Amino acid sequence: DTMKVINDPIHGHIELHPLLVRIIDTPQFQRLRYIKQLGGGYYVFPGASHNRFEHSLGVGYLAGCLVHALGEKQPELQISERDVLCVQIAGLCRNLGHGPFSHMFDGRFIPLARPEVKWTHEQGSVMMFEHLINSNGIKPVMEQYGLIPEEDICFIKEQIVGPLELWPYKGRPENKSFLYEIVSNKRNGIDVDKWDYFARDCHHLGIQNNFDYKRFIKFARVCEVDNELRICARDKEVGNLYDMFHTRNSLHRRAYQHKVGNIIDTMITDAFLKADDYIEITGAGGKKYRISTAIDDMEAYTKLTDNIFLEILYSTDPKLKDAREILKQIEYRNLFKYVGETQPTGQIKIKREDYESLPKEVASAKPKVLLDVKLKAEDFIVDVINMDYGMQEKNPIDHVSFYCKTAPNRAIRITKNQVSQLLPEKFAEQLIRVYCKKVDRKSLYAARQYFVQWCADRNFTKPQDGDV
Amino acid sequence: DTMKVINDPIHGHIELHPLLVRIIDTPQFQRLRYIKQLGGGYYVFPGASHNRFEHSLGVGYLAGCLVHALGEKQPELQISERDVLCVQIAGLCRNLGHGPFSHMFDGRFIPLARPEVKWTHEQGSVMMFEHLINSNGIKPVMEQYGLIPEEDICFIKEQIVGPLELWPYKGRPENKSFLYEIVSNKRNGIDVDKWDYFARDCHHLGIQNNFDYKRFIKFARVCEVDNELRICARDKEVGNLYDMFHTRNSLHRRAYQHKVGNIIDTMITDAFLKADDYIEITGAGGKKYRISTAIDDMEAYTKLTDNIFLEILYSTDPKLKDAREILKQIEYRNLFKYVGETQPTGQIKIKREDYESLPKEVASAKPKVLLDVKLKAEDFIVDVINMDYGMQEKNPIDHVSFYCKTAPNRAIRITKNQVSQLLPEKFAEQLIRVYCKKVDRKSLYAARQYFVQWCADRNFTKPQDGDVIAPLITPQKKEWN
Amino acid sequence: DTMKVINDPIHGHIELHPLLVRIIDTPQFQRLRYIKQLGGGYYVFPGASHNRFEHSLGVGYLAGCLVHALGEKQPELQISERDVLCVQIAGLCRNLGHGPFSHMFDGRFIPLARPEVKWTHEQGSVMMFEHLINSNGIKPVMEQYGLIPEEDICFIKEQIVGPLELWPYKGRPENKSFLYEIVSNKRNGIDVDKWDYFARDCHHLGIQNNFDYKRFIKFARVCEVDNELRICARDKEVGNLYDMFHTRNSLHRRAYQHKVGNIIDTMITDAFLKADDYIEITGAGGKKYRISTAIDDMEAYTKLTDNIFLEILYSTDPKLKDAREILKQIEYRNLFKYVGETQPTGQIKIKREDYESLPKEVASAKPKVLLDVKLKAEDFIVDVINMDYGMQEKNPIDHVSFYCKTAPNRAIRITKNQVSQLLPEKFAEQLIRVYCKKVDRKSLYAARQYFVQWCADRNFTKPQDGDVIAPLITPQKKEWN
Amino acid sequence: TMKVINDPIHGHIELHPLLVRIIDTPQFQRLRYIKQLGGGYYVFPGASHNRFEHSLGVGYLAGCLVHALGEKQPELQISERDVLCVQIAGLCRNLGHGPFSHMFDGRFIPLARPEVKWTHEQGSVMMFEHLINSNGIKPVMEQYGLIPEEDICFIKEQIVGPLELWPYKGRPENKSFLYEIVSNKRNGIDVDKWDYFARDCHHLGIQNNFDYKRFIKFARVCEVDNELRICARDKEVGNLYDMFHTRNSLHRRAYQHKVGNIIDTMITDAFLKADDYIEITGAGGKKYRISTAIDDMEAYTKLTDNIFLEILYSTDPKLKDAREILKQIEYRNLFKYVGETQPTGQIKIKREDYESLPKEVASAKPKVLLDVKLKAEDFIVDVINMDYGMQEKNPIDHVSFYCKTAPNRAIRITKNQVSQLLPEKFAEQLIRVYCKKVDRKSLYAARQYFVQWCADRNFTKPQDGDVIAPLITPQKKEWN
Ligand SMILES: Nc1ncnc2c1ncn2[C@H]1C[C@H](O)[C@@H](COP(=O)(O)OP(=O)(O)OP(=O)(O)O)O1
Ligand SMILES: Nc1ncnc2c1ncn2[C@H]1C[C@H](O)[C@@H](COP(=O)(O)OP(=O)(O)OP(=O)(O)O)O1
Ligand SMILES: Nc1ncnc2c1ncn2[C@H]1C[C@H](O)[C@@H](COP(=O)(O)OP(=O)(O)OP(=O)(O)O)O1
Ligand SMILES: Nc1ncnc2c1ncn2[C@H]1C[C@H](O)[C@@H](COP(=O)(O)OP(=O)(O)OP(=O)(O)O)O1
Ligand SMILES: [Mg+2]
Ligand SMILES: [Mg+2]
Ligand SMILES: [Mg+2]
Ligand SMILES: [Mg+2]
Ligand SMILES: [Mg+2]
Ligand SMILES: [Mg+2]
Ligand SMILES: [Mg+2]
Ligand SMILES: [Mg+2]
Ligand SMILES: [Mg+2]
Ligand code: NA
Ligand code: NA
Ligand code: NA
Ligand code: NA
Ligand code: NI
């Protein structure tokens, strides 16, 4: 078992320690080859064929790059080879919980199929990591390379999902606090997962990446902030950090929240819902699970991938007919039709647990002029989109710490005022898109009148008339 | 309704005429989203996630770029908008016949499952195009945009598969001969399908493309060669054309024939073979097909994609157990082990019908080394790979014609010795790779001794690591020392 | 005298019409090989070795791309081959008036050397174009290719500098109004010069940008707005347009206004000022000009390039000693030292005529700290930088018009609040950087106390490192705590 | 301490403070004013890059390779001192280049100073010595743990080779591998090529297909015939053949472009005409010429591409002939390409025969009605050697490899073990002929002299031979 070299188009030739190779070469990790990073966005950007697997390799690589760079510049942090391997493992494994079509699964499908459950891809990642470790004999291999599984499994999970409920972490003590800001940074959102997907998604989408993670790594240092060691950026680089969140927002606008990519995601979700009683996934002890229950057994979840779409598409069973017909309509490009768009006024946000009530509100609106067609709640889709800098209404740069060239061990803060008067004054907004499943010209005309009336009833922004 | 613009990572924003959009938006074309361009190469190069779909859009785009450029520089060729659309449709549709994991299917699986049949992805493409046209009402849309379906369907199919039986084509007459050199060029191999996959495979593999197709297009013209209109290159550019085939050969060497990518393809094929008697695919009239017979019914073939690998991998049926276990071993990376590589010396070339005899020959070699373990024929895989410049033994540049700046419509020939002494003297070769299915350290040591002995017995080239893997076998052969 | 092909790293293989080749192959155009696009930026970003020449070729190319695209999609605009060539010539020639080190010359040097004169690179380009045309016999070549020089020279100059003198242009009538929005767009700043330098500067600097000009061209059309034909964009593209100006601002912040690039430009300017009495440049009729007067005679200006820096650096004349010493200090990297950066709060714009008073204000600040070393006004440089979206306080997207796909002849406006709440609220600001000419550790410590005190006195923003550089000064200001 | 520089090819590069002290000198900054590709900028408008940025890249890559070897093989005992010395040598190996890079040492000096034997490598050693002594670098070297007597010798040896059994004095035999990084005289594989492949491609608009990072990942040091050498992985042999194929490509497409070369020729002819009259001040106020500035590093420090513009902008009547040549370049009134041929076999025209070739072309007797009659001085004959960096030899015969199963055991690999599609020779010559008389009748006649000369000396048929000289190509049955 020696170092393996892998050639990635984004990062070039990456070295994998043999413990990481042992983790990668398992059913639970290889599964990520069959889950598209961008889900339905491939049906809009034909270059966006990339899967979660290759992204995970990239995240693991970058996690290793940052921890190594901090260790080389600051030997006093006493970063050990054990620490480095743990950080790489967490980076590699933080996408293990994603389901079919990535964000479609946790963002659209599970909230509709299992409204009572509180599922996140992060919790899924921890559950899947645990299942990976336990099914493949990884603990004794960890010991063989000097990891202490009791402490180090806890550390890896904590880096993925946060404190597993004073210093709240158990995997490492406070003097290694900075290690928890690499893989998933809950304090300000600056972490290696974004860095990989900015570069990788851009390469495949055909949009150029404008953030330079390498530069950020070169300038990162650890300093003491309120009696905790934290990753700090150079003061001068504050503008690049505002630009990094601007880039994320751009990618959301152009690609991840594309109105057609989103309706494709919605149609796939509607097909899974219609198929859910009939697709069977075998889990532990030969028990049978459904698409919506596979999250309750990691053996079954291991086998839940984008394949489910083609299982439905290629089915012949008449019980799957309605589900299959939705997917067939995607192939013919007979999509549910865009009716229009609005925004809430102020800092008003429609919360997730109101999502399912919105189609009935639109259908119950009492429009402008009398109508020939009457539409019902189930004829409307109402897609609520949050665009923000990753910290709800907050400016994430208020939660970054900086150092100056003349005192590189002294952390400081920088306010927005001190940076630039051309920056945004708000950091979150919401867009509401409405679509109609009835596509004839009379239904669509009526759907538009319901929509515009609803906007007026809710005091939302007056829709642009756009087309018509 | 209207023209669509699509953002492709290789070519940027490309325009799709509404007839092309009508062809794209069908189950027969969208199928190509579920077939990986490089098959098992993704299990070696993790960037190589791209599918035949986006390649096909790129081929159609490039076909349109070349035909438009010829028409703009030479209005005297009388290239019509109808011709342009036909050439674009052929470029878009020339990959329709590919099967699961692309070259694995027609290159490895079908030859082993149906040895009596003569299947190519080209014939597949023609059959699938026909099925696409007839199942989706495309003929009246063709008429609406000025095509004459009977004649233009024939032209499109001819551009894909070649003459469908003195001028042998029926789709266009002799004065548009150059149109048959864009999508699939049977005379010299220079066509737009290569240009797309050079750029696209490189972008995703993480290897850089050295050929500039745009430059070639700027310098291409049509001239009369031996009473036929042909696409000719500028004289000066002959070196770039040698380099283009050198690039193709490089991509084969580095990626498409990667020794581990090939063994993964071989293991996937062996899994499909073991699954073939049990997976059912419904086709026309509700008739049932197998993976190996789905090529005989386009309705069934429409539903034969890379999904088959996951159908096998996730199955619970006990009859699929042997097939599923192969794929599981791929996931654990318990792959058949590479033993080594050699080439025939001279002009002898091992023919397909001798492939099955090779594992027995390796196993019957008599290495004079201490061996504990004894291996059998079935413990060895022998993979024979043909590397050439696309025209078997021939130099494809001897089949290109050139023009000079002082007489741009007058075609000439250029010989290899007029270009450079640094160019190849031979244009085809074979590589032979050996692998062992027994993976332990003693089996692999023994497999290496049988291998190197067999090479010496057959007068093949000395393996590159031959002195390290078989130090006691290499001194016997005086040619190697 | 047919089409020449040129390989550019940004745009690939570009075609040049023979008239454009005749204009390029003149001393007045080739001069742009010896002027760096980014001036002193090369001394910070070592990839930024590119010259105005190659930028100009790119601008000409893009001007041709946009005008061709509009003419192909909208034949009713009656865009002629003559119009296309005129637009290409204007794009090619709009950088002809640049001086040594590009923006250093018109932005720093000429304002200080000739405070009474009003010089811009645009006026320079018109004067240089006229000199190019008249010295090289271009008018008969223009006629040969169907241009009417009297009208078309006027058109080309107008496209560079704006109306030369109710429809104010004389080169083309109102029905070709949209032609004046390609090369230099004074109405909203969207023109092809930016598109080239975004791509080219990024390629050389080692910074990437996410603006796609090709996409913009696909979605651009000409529509009637308030009885004038204008270039409009598809409604969906509004976000991209905000991003395009965000990218320009980024490039300014990261590269063009780099604090060290600017101090290098300042030191080069100070060297030119010290050399200005002594360098002689021969112009028309053997008359002698200085660096600062060469703008008054295009024959002399033709010979005024970045070479002046090396003429000074390599000189032995004792009268050039002070100038030469400055440049030698640049080579040793003994640069003026950066003290810090602040911004005015509110809508205080510091005006140009107050620039010279700022060093005295910093030096007169009364920091309330033990200061052993004493600094003077002449020890401080104060560089005031205006950053904006190209139309001072205005949002340039308020001056773009957009069309919906289903009504492509109806242009409308889109307001900022209809696009996003996360957009800027202001479109112009100023940065003030302070530097010290005394470079030792004690001088710099003192300079930082003067600086931070001055900021507090003027109610400027708290410098980012303010608490580290001036720990005794920042607590006085309650606004900062 | 460490300075960060953003380079477009390598990204953000760290420079140790000793390297920064070397860079920030007049002797190093000079390289900002010397174009990497000389006259090639007049053909490829992207090729504006200078020797400066290339040098930074070479230093960076030298550091990357030595660090990689030291991290994978701690038993080599590579010290931080060794690393810095290797980086300094990489940074400084281009210091000796002159105006327009290869034009200076390849065309100008051989013609202006035929008695002297000058190379850019010797220039680099002289310039390095001058840089060190004029800028007080020795005490800074000591401050960072270098021993200047030994380490200056090592750096110079890495640039120019052995300065007089193990022939090097800067390091002993157990660090032999250190001398294969910056300039590898045994097989040509070094970091200078790797930088210019990537950088020249970026600026030319041609894409690089060699992956130096991959080579570094697979490089190891093994004992070969009792010497420690840098070896490559056996599998990677194909990539190494491709690396020299890429170099040959870049030469064919760009470095030896027929117009780029004629522009270099015309620039050289201008310098020769200016050489008696341009003065460059050097040490002690002594005056030097363009051709003698190589003898005094203070004057050479001030000899850059500026000399072209000094000539172009001059008014001195003694510079008139030189200035007129350069003005003709601006108007694109260039000497005209007549054609191209190659010697047959392994026949090779030697440098000392170059000047006699125009007389041979002019003395050819074409057998055609010619109104115009041309003389020796109307012809330029440019002889170009294209090879894999070791004359007739295959450079892969001088590479050592290791196998995965015995990474300490070096082996050799022959060409026939790799592929039958590889080149059968590793060197050739191209001969290009140009005419200084540019009218249509002169050029017609020049083509007949040219094609006749080719037939007389059994040379290869010109590619357009049947269109340029339809009445001359029928002589030769090999061509028909
Ligand atoms: N010539 C090449 N250029 C670029 N990438 C390559 C090349 N050959 C292979 N690759 C890629 C494929 C992988 O992602 C990565 C490692 O492949 P390779 O070095 O061929 O590993 P291997 O595991 O097959 O070899 P081995 O086990 O013999 O060392 O590099
Ligand atoms: N801002 C962008 N930059 C780059 N690519 C984009 C951007 N927005 C969308 N794309 C991609 C996705 C598609 O491949 C292609 C066309 O998408 P888009 O312009 O959104 O067309 P559309 O079909 O969705 O809208 P419409 O029908 O209204 O023109 O461009
Ligand atoms: N093989 C190549 N690949 C890429 N770019 C090249 C190549 N050869 C030349 N170039 C560049 C240099 C110029 O910028 C542009 C035109 O070169 P080239 O076609 O050689 O023109 P030319 O003027 O020398 O030829 P001619 O006048 O015979 O047509 O292309
Ligand atoms: N935002 C940026 N993105 C990319 N490159 C940058 C950026 N800003 C500066 N550069 C380039 C210019 C240089 O080649 C290199 C170092 O610049 P920079 O870090 O600004 O150095 P500095 O020497 O001005 O700062 P200091 O001395 O304060 O640390 O990075
Ligand atoms: Mg391996
Ligand atoms: Mg993330
Ligand atoms: Mg996100
Ligand atoms: Mg659309
Ligand atoms: Mg082909
Ligand atoms: Mg092939
Ligand atoms: Mg030419
Ligand atoms: Mg600095
Ligand atoms: Mg040499
Ligand atoms: Na964390
Ligand atoms: Na204008
Ligand atoms: Na500036
Ligand atoms: Na050496
Ligand atoms: Ni560049």
What is the residue extent of each domain of chain D? 1-333, 334-480
Report the distance separating Cα B47 and Cα B203, nearest Å.
Answer: 8
Residues 6 or more apart from D262 whose CB is under 8 A from it?
D334, D335, D337, D380, D382, D434
Asked whether D38 and D264 are in contact (CB, 8 A), the reply is yes
Q: Which residues contact D282 (CB under 8 A, 6 or more apart)?
A: D288, D293, D296, D297, D298, D299, D300, D302
Homologous superfamily (CATH) for D1-333? Hypothetical protein af1432 (1.10.3210.10)
- Give me the count of residues in chain C: 481
Ligand 16 mean position to C104 CA, how many Å?
7
- Ligand 3 geometric centre to CA of D120 (Å): 29
Name residue, tokens 């708290």.
C462
Q: Which of B473, B468, B43, B20 is nearest to B255 (CA)?
A: B43
Which amino acids bring their CB within 6 angstroms of ligand 2?
A 44-45, 207, 254, 260; B 5-7; C 212, 215, 236, 240, 405
From C271, C342, C252, select the one nearest C309 (Cα to Cα): C271
Give dist(CA C132, CA C301) in Å, integer: 12
Tokens of D394: 């295959």
Q: How far is CA A445 from CA A459, B250, C410, in A?
A: 21, 58, 21
SS3 of C289, please? strand
The token pair at D413 is 């690999």
How far is the C-alpha of C308 from the C-alpha of D339, rounded, in Å?
40
Separation CA C287–CA B189 (nearest Å): 65
Pick the closest to residue B371 from B455, B467, B451, B465 (CA basis).
B451
Q: What are phi and psi of D250, to 5 degrees?
A: -60, -40
Cα(C316)–Cα(C331) distance, rounded to whole angstroms?
17
d(CA D18, CA D143): 9
Q: What phi and psi values does residue A342 have, to the nearest 5 degrees?
A: -150, 170
Distances (CA, A) of A157 to A19, A27, A89, D174: 17, 19, 10, 47
Tokens of D1: 């301490």
Fold of domain A1-334: Hypothetical protein af1432 (1.10.3210)
Give the closest of B205, B307, B314 to A303, CB-based. B314
Give how far the C-alpha of residue D246 lies from the chain's centroid of Cα atoms, to the nearest Å.
Answer: 15
CA distance D330 to C33: 11
Per-position b or e across D287-298, b if 16+ CB within 10 A of its CB: ebbbbbbbbbbb
Tell me which H or E stretch contains C443.
helix C441-457
Residue D182 to chain B, least CA–CA distance (Å): 25
Q: Output the six-digit token pair for C317.
A: 């004349």
- On the CB side of D283, CA atoms within 13 Å amount to 10
For tokens 């195009």, the residue is: B129
Range C271-284 burial, b when 16+ CB lie within 10 A, else e: bbbbbbeebebbbe
Strand pairing partners for B407?
B404
Distance from chain centroid for Cα B359: 26
Structure token digits, residue A422:
């051309």
Nearest CA to ligand 1 atom 20: B258
Atom of ligand 1 minimally distant from the CA of B205:
5
CA nearest D206: which of D258, D247, D254? D254
Packing angle of the helix pair D148-160, D120-134 (nearest 10 deg): 160
Active site residues of D: 120
Q: What is the DSSP letter of C462?
A: P
Whether A307 and B310 lie within 8 Å, measured CB to CB = yes
The CA angle C277-C279-C283, to the nearest 5 degrees, is 110
Contact D442, D378 (CB under 8 A): yes
Sole residue written with tokens 């073991």 = B274
The amino acid present at B481, given as its one-letter code, is N
- The answer to whether B330 touches B268, Cβ cutoff 8 Å, is yes
- Cα–Cα distances (Å) from D400 to A16, C7, D222, D414, in that order, read 26, 39, 9, 11
Q: Would you give the distance in Å from CA A317 to the centre of its chain?
A: 34
* Token output for D425: 């020779």
SS3 content of chain C, % helix, strand, coil (to 5): 55, 15, 35
Pairing of strands B288-289, B281-282: antiparallel
Cβ contact C331–D29 (<8 Å) = yes
> Are the C-beta atoms of residues B215 and B234 closer than 8 Å to each other?
no
If DSSP codes are grouped into helix, strand and coil, which group holds residue A11? coil
Expressed in Å, this structure's resolution amounts to 1.9
Per-residue three-class SS string for chain D: CCEEEEECCCEEEEECHHHHHHHCCHHHHHHHHCECCHHHHHCCCCCCCEHHHHHHHHHHHHHHHHHHHHHHCHHHCCCHHHHHHHHHHHHHCCCCCCCCCHHHHHHHHHHHCCCCCCCHHHHHHHHHHHHHHHCCHHHHHHHCCCCHHHHHHHHHHHHHCCCCCCCCCCCCHHHHHHHHCCCCCCCCCCHHHHHHHHHHHHHHCCCCCCCHHHHHHHCEEEEECCEEEEEEEHHHHHHHHHHHHHHHHHHHHHHCCHHHHHHHHHHHHHHHHHCCCCCEECHHHCEECCCCHHHCHHHHCCCCCHHHHHHHCCCCHHHHHHHHHHHHHHCCCCCEEEEEECCCCCCCCCHHHHHHHHHHHHHCCCCCCCCCCCCHHHEEEEEEEEECCCCCCCHHHHCCEEECCEEEEEECCCHHHHCCCCECCCEEEEEEEEECCCCHHHHHHHHHHHHHHHHHCCCCCCCCHHHHCCCCHHHCHHHC
Is the Cβ–Cβ distance between C255 and C201 less than 8 Å? Answer: yes
- Say if residue B440 is exposed, middle or buried (CB neighbours under 10 Å; 0-12, 13-18, 19+): exposed
| Contact present, A442 and A367 (Cβ < 8 Å) | no
Q: CB count, 10 Å around CB of A48?
A: 26
Four-residue CA torsion sign, A22, A25, A31, A36: positive
- State which H helix or E strand residue B323 sits in: helix B321-331
- List the alpha helices (DSSP H) in C136-180: 138-144, 149-161
Query: Residue D477 carries which side chain, given as an amino acid letter?
Result: K
Contact at CB, C239 and A247, closer than 8 angstroms: no
Distances B397 to B199, B403, B414, D263 between C-alpha atoms, Å: 21, 14, 8, 31
CB within 8 Å: A15 and D214: no
CB–CB of C308/C291 below 8 Å?
yes
Q: Is C207 helix (H, G, I), strand (E, B) or coil?
A: coil
Helix (H) / strand (E) containing A381 = strand A380-388
**CA torsion through residues D284, D286, D289, D293, sign:** negative
Strand-pairing partners, residue D15, are D3
Task: With CA atoms as reference, report the closest residue to C311 among D38, D300, D313, D103.
Answer: D313
The one-letter code for the residue type at C462 is K
Q: Chain A contact for D405, CB < 8 A?
A: no
Flag whether residue A57 sits within 8 Å of chain B, measured between CB atoms: yes
In B168-268 the beta strands, taken as DSSP E runs, fall at 221-225, 228-234
- The answer, for C116 touching chain A at a CB cutoff of 8 Å, is no
Distance CA C246, CA D158 (A): 48
Query: Which residue of chain A comes nearest to C207, CA vs CA?
Result: A210
Separation between Cα atoms, residue C467 and residue C227, nearest integer Å: 57
User: Which tokens in the block code for residue A171?
Assistant: 């995997």
Q: How was this structure determined?
A: X-ray
User: With contact defined as beta carbons under 8 Å apart, do D298 and D288 qualify?
Assistant: no
Q: Quote the CA–CA distance of A92 and A133 in Å, as a whole number.
A: 13
How is B41-63 classified by DSSP, letter by letter? GGGTSTT---BHHHHHHHHHHHH
B270 vs B276: CA distance, rounded Å: 10
Q: Which of C1, C4, C7 to mutate to test the interface with D (most CBs of D within 10 A)?
A: C7
Distance separating alpha carbons of residues A15 and D72, to the nearest angstrom: 12
CB-CB under 8 Å, D304 with C331: no
Q: How far apart are CA B314 and CA B331, in angstroms?
A: 12
Residue keyed to tokens 């240009």: B195
Binding partners of D (≥3 Cβ pairs within 8 A):
A, B, C
Nearest to C414 by CA among A256, A453, A422, A465: A465
Q: Which amino acid is at B35?
A: I
Residue length of chain A: 468
Q: In DSSP terms, which residues pair with D427 in a beta bridge?
A: D387
Burial class (CB in 10 A: 0-12, 13-18, 19+), A323: buried
Instruction: Go through B320-351 and write b for each residue having 16 or more CB atoms within 10 A of its CB, e for each that does not.
Output: beebbebbeebbebebbbbbbbbbbeeeeebe
Mutate to test the pocket of ligand 3, among B209, B215, B246, B403 (most ligand atoms within 8 A of CB): B215
